[PDB]
Amino acid sequence: AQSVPYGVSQIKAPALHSQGYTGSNVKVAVIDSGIDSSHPDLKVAGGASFVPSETNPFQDNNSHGTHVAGTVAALDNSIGVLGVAPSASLYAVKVLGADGSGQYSWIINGIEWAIANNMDVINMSLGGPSGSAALKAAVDKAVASGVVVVAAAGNEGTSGSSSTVGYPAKYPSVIAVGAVDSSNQRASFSSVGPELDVMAPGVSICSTLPGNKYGAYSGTSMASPHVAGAAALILSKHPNWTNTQVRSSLENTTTKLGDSFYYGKGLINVQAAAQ
Ligand SMILES: [Ca+2]
């Protein structure tokens, strides 16, 4: 039978699924280590691989990409888990390899592909301690072109009085997502900083793994897809919304939790955000 992970319920997504808003016709890109399409609980529309050593984007040799994909769009049916946007057209943009590592040229090319193939939402459950003029530009270009770009704040914890949010999450154009547990307490690994925007569930997140499996992972990497899915649910109710309206709606309707340096605007509530 099907189990709804606590996270999907915490951001109040099932309220919209019941209104008939499941994210149908919204295209979301999982810029990651590819997505295993043979999972009975996932429906991958297309994608591309920018990893030179790994040509099949529908092959995830790591486990990370599939997991992230399931939190966004695991199918609403009688098996496994449920995503935030179960009817979303999932796109596997493989920019990371089997060891989970990827080069910025690969990531940047993955973001570029997402723009020309008109993705409504881009999800980047990845990041680094350094930027690039090409990375800044790739993500800014996506936003200028109406794409909602979501990214994990990073898993660097606190650092005195400084920001530990990595890139591309550190950029003003990118929605940097941190992690909260079930009780709404910031996960100690979640990056902090003035660049944090919202928080989404990220501790012990149950989702899809390669080869008809389900397993839990903890990270801001698992936080990100709840906000990516949430942006897709909002878009299915209001298809006329610009990426800017999806964003301000998501940040202005949050549940305030603590100081913005550690919580951003707070926990996203997609029910209040969709309006
Ligand atoms: Ca399912």
Curated annotation (Swiss-Prot):
GO terms for cellular component: extracellular region. It is an enzyme of class 3 (hydrolase). Its cofactor is Ca(2+). Ca(2+) 1 binds at residues 2, 41, 75, 77, 79, 81. Its EC number is 3.4.21.62. Keywords: Calcium, Hydrolase, Metal-binding, Protease, Secreted, Serine protease, Signal, Sporulation, Zymogen. Binds 2 calcium ions per subunit. Ca(2+) 2 binds at residues 169, 171, 174. Used as a detergent protease. Sold under the name Alcalase by Novozymes. Completely inhibited by phenylmethylsulfony fluoride (PMSF) and partially inhibited by benzamidine hydrochloride, leupeptin, and pepstatin A. One of its GO terms (biological process) is sporulation resulting in formation of a cellular spore. Optimum temperature is 48 degrees Celsius. Subtilisin is an extracellular alkaline serine protease, it catalyzes the hydrolysis of proteins and peptide amides. Has a high substrate specificity to fibrin. This is Subtilisin BPN'. The chain holds residues 108 to 382 of 382 of the full protein.
